[PDB]
Amino acid sequence: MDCSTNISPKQGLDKAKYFSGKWYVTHFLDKDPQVTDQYCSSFTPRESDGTVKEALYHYNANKKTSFYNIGEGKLESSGLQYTAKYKTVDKKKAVLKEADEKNSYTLTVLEADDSSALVHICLREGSKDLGDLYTVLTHQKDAEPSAKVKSAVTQAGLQLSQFVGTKDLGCQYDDQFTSL
């Protein structure tokens, strides 16, 4: 399944609002799961001189297992958009696999304000797009997304009610891992 084509970062976005705190996914819209399991996610993005580093957590709400990654990529000349290669780590950040050259994701920020954000993620391996995801983000677990971000969903051509809301999933987070 092809990642979504009309995706570009919102211009005028202040990078300090996006590379701020930690993010929790409150809603996600996944185009074509080759998996039926539903996930929760939290991550902590930081940027310096155009390089983005982010600690990334996923919790499988069906199996009740968690996995961990560290992404690294460069900002585009376009604005708040980056393609990241990623390490696979354990909960203590010990590296299981280094980043490689075939596995990457491209994250594009479509809205970000003081409390909330809307991003798009296209996950790829080699010549294949593996996932396309929109995620609504907030800075605390189950905080309400802002009006601005709900408007950005509607402006992306989407319906917020068609996203999966993560509150109902019994999410568990590892706030230790996403600290720093």
CB of 150 to ligand HEM, least distance (A): 17
Q: Which of 146, 167, 168, 150 is nearest to 159 (CA)?
A: 150
Q: Does 73 bind ligand [C-]#N (CB under 6 A)?
A: no
Could you say which residues in the range 147-176 bind ligand [C-]#N, by CB under 6 A? Answer: none
Q: How far apart are the first and last CA of the chain?
A: 34
- 26 contact, one of ligand [C-]#N, ligand HEM, none, CB 5-8 Å limit per kind: none
Tokens of 116: 């909330």
- 73 contact, one of ligand [C-]#N, ligand HEM, none, CB 5-8 Å limit per kind: none
Distance CA 136, CA 150 (A): 9
DSSP label of 148: H
- 28 contact, one of ligand [C-]#N, ligand HEM, none, CB 5-8 Å limit per kind: ligand HEM
Residues β-bridged to residue 112: 117
Distance CA 28, CA 13 (A): 21
C-alpha distances in angstroms, 142 versus 4, 44, 153?
A: 27, 16, 18
- 81 contact, one of ligand HEM, ligand [C-]#N, none, CB 5-8 Å limit per kind: none
| Residue 27 in marked binding region | no
Residues β-bridged to residue 72: 53, 85
Could you say which residues in the range 97-136 bind ligand [C-]#N, by CB under 6 A? Answer: 121, 123, 131, 133
Contacting positions for ligand HEM (CB under 6 A): 25, 28, 30, 35, 39-41, 43, 56, 58, 69, 86, 88, 105, 107, 121, 123, 133, 135, 166
Residue numbers in the known binding site for heme are: 58
